[PDB]
């Protein structure tokens, strides 16, 4: 029943937030269960829970503030939040905006997002997310589970990397029940999109019409071991989708998706193995390779 | 007559709230103190339990908004008397059907006194006869509790009713427990499972220790069973049980789904980490619609064995995954110094299981087993 | 007058240190116990909070080297009074 944030840090270092429970704020603004805000650094959050808030855990800053950096999450449960895990740096998202010099280093494990929704209408009815990463450099995610029984709560994008974000690793992800969202995992391209991201060992159980989606103008993405199920999806399109041709892809399988891979406007209906750049296999030594 | 005035000055000071001795509790290991407890709880005050072996003739009922904190494990002890009948849990919530709210239990031993019944006896049916039973309850915080000599479970979290519901697969049982926290607790000498959940959501089981069951059936250190969902288990330990952590269901039950494990130590169990959905393993059997989502990190399996002969001498495993869809494992270490304990398969994925990630695995010492990691094929692989 | 001697024997035993009721705290959900707190903290002793709803009219200030342990959640309660102004944190 708080006004702003349940548990929060500012301009401080060396903090362990452990086995806590922040829930059910009074208001509708930036009402986050846990908020690691302006100037924060070297924080560990382990085995906490959040419920009925906007952000389950938010690691951010304001325009005139340095972003929280070197933040760890050793397990978290996020229940019925809007954006279960929301990392950003306000005022460093637009193309013309200056680049953040502070938004660095996030390591997260055992992340649980349950029934993400915005029934209470936080942040001008912001669209729900299991995870949203913006502005930040160096984000590591190991083991993330998103679960919902109600497909109507989230409709846009389950997971997204965006707004100038770089160097992100998504490893060991299970998203299920999101059978009415457009994208499971979406690396947004365009003028201020995300780049340099690894998506590996991901299973989508009826989650996203486009399973993994990579936007335009993106130079460097790695996609390995993605397997999807799309029977119970409303009009599924592709297990993996990529508008340009230079993401690298291996280990794709799915059932119920009409296309396993759409890359640069081409169907690879039983999957692709794609490498870009100089190639060498089964050789003892070599000189120059273009 | 003088001491009684001094006592009744302290009893009005309420340093911890109302003491249970204020209402006539002895805690001498002989006197039946049941009425003193019932009075203290209904008073609307936080009940405190000082030193002593507080005997009891019938199960302690807990109404909504109760604070019950004692003096510690093996300090404030609560025990069943040698002549208590059958059908009651040592401690449990009052409203069995629709549950209660805001219960806080801290720092005491619960001796179920199964000893009184003889060798090899367990609960007579349903969630009955555990050292602690939380049914259909919201916001329960259980800390620093030791459960010894249990008839059924040490600690059991379940939905409304004394019997476990069997509404088939794909169903969600009415009146579930919600927002449960279990920390620093110990379970031992139990009939079924040390710490267990049923048909309930939003649970954190943290830094607990379940070990050494009395029996030989499905005696699991931690068992996330029928209808369970959204559970985090972090930094617990299990020893000398069948399953270190079991995430399963029965045939006529929906499987536990969306379960997290943020580190666990499994010592000398049979199947350290055992996930399955009974009745959804055979080829002709219907596919599970509930067995989804497991994320596990820092899993430790030590000396897996079946010397005690659990489950008709089931073969030992560091990990076994069955029926489940979407299992993520990051960082698993299996260690043994005795190669003869496990001989079949160290790790196995089987019985219709799909979408499994094994990442960062160290298996050592299993120099007499046929397979390290085995993904079984065949008709239902 | 008899109970007051018994109390002042216990208050010198200091089982948890100095209790806050020793310095005149009621914890009855009505009485303003602010001065009892400020006194207990400045004494240099670990302050203990027993059962009760300890009302307050202004924010509790905490100096260096303070130990403040109560009887538990929903047991030892600290509350702002219905007529407290604006600009202060309950505890800081
Ligand atoms: Ca905020
Ligand atoms: Ca069992
Ligand atoms: Mg802030
Ligand atoms: Mg069971």
UniProtKB/Swiss-Prot annotation, chain A:
Disulfide bonding pattern of the chain: none
Subcellular location: Virion
Post-translational modification: Autocleaved to produce the 74 kDa gp12* assembly attached to the phage particles. Autocleavage of the C-terminus is a posttrimerization event that is followed by an ATP-dependent release.
Residue sites binding Mg(2+) per the record: 10, 35, 37
Superkingdom of the source species: Viruses
UniProt note: domains: The N-terminus has three domains that function to attach the appendages to the phage, digest the cell wall teichoic acids, and bind irreversibly to the host. The C-terminus is an autochaperone that aids trimerization.
Oligomer and partners: Homotrimer. Each appendage is a homotrimer of gp12*.
Role, per record: Structural component of the 12 appendages that hang from the lower collar. Adhesion protein that binds to the host cell surface during virus attachment and mediates teichoic acids degradation.
Protein name: Pre-neck appendage protein
Native source species: Bacillus phage phi29 (Bacteriophage phi-29)
UniProtKB/Swiss-Prot annotation, chain C:
Subcellular location: Virion
Domain of life: Viruses
Post-translational modification (record): Autocleaved to produce the 74 kDa gp12* assembly attached to the phage particles. Autocleavage of the C-terminus is a posttrimerization event that is followed by an ATP-dependent release.
Oligomeric form and interacting partners: Homotrimer. Each appendage is a homotrimer of gp12*.
Free-text comment about domains: The N-terminus has three domains that function to attach the appendages to the phage, digest the cell wall teichoic acids, and bind irreversibly to the host. The C-terminus is an autochaperone that aids trimerization.
Function according to Swiss-Prot or TrEMBL: Structural component of the 12 appendages that hang from the lower collar. Adhesion protein that binds to the host cell surface during virus attachment and mediates teichoic acids degradation.
Record-given protein name: Pre-neck appendage protein
Residue numbers of the full-length protein present here: 89 to 179 of 854
């Amino acid at each position: 029943g708080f006004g702003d944030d349940g548990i929060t840090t500012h301009h401080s270092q060396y903090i362990n937030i452990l086995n806590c429970y922040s829930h059910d704020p009074r208001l509708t603004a930036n009402c986050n269960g846990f908020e690691i805000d302006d100037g924060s650094r070297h924080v560990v959050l382990s085995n906490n829970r959040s419920k009925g808030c906007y952000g389950g855990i938010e690691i951010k800053a304001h325009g005139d503030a340095p972003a929280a950096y070197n933040i760890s999450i050793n397990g978290h449960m996020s229940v019925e939040d809007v954006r279960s895990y929301n990392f950003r740096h306000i005022g460093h998202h637009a193309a013309t905006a200056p680049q953040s010099v502070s938004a660095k280093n996030i390591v997260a494990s055992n992340l649980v997002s349950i029934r993400p929704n915005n029934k209470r209408g936080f942040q001008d009815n912001a669209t729900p997310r299991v995870l949203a990463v913006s502005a930040y450099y160096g984000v590591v995610i190991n083991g993330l589970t998103g679960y919902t029984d109600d497909p109507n709560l989230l409709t846009e994008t389950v997971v997204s990397v965006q707004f100038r974000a770089r160097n992100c690793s998504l490893n060991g992800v299970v998203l299920t029940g999101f059978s009415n969202s457009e994208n499971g995992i979406y690396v947004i391209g365009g003028s201020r999109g995300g780049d340099a991201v690894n998506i590996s060992n991901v299973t989508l159980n009826n989650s996203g019409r486009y399973g993994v989606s990579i936007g335009s103008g993106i130079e460097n993405v790695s996609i390995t071991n993605i397997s999807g199920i799309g029977d119970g999806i409303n009009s599924p399109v592709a297990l993996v989708s990529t508008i340009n041709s230079n993401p690298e892809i291996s280990g794709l399988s799915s059932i119920g998706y009409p296309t396993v891979a759409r890359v640069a406007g081409t169907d690879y209906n039983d999957g692709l193995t794609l490498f870009n750049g100089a190639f060498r296999a089964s050789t003892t030594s070599s000189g120059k390779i273009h | 007559h003088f001491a009684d005035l001094v006592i009744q000055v302290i009893d009005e000071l309420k340093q911890f709230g109302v003491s249970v001795k204020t209402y006539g509790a002895k805690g001498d290991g002989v006197t039946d103190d049941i009425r003193a407890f019932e009075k203290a709880i209904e008073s609307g005050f936080p009940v405190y339990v000082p030193y002593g072996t507080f005997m009891v003739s019938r199960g302690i009922k807990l109404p909504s908004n109760t604070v019950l904190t004692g003096a510690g494990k093996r300090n404030a002890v609560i025990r069943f008397m040698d002549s208590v009948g059958r059908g009651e849990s040592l401690m449990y919530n009052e409203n069995v059907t629709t549950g209660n709210e805001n219960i806080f239990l801290s720092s005491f031993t619960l001796d179920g006194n199964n000893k009184r019944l003889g060798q090899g006896i367990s609960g007579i049916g349903g969630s009955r006869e555990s050292n602690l039973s939380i049914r259909a309850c919201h916001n329960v915080y259980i800390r620093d509790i030791e459960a010894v000599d249990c008839t059924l479970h040490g600690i059991d979290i379940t939905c409304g009713g004394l019997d476990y519901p069997y509404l088939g697969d794909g169903t969600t049982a009415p009146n579930p427990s919600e927002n449960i926290w279990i920390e620093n607790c110990e379970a031992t000498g139990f009939g079924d499972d040390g710490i267990t959940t049923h048909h309930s959501q939003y649970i954190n089981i943290l830094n607990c220790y379940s070990h050494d069951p009395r029996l030989t059936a499905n005696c699991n250190g931690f068992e996330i069973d029928d209808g369970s969902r959204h559970v985090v288990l972090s930094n617990n330990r299990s020893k000398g049980c069948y399953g270190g952590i079991e995430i399963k269901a029965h045939g006529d039950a929906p499987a536990a789904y969306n379960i997290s494990i943020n580190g666990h130590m499994s010592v000398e169990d049979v199947r350290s980490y055992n996930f399955r959905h009974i009745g959804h393993h055979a080829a002709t059997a219907p596919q599970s619609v509930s067995a989804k989502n497991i994320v596990a990190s820092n899993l430790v399996s030590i000396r897996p064995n079946n010397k005690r002969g659990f489950q008709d001498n089931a073969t030992p495993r560091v990990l076994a995954v069955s029926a489940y869809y979407g299992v993520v494992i990051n960082g698993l270490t299996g260690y043994t110094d005795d190669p003869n304990l496990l001989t079949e398969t160290v790790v196995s994925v089987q019985f219709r299981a799909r979408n499994c990630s094994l990442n960062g695995v160290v298996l050592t010492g299993f120099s007499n087993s046929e397979n390290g990691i085995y993904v079984i094929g065949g008709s239902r692989g």
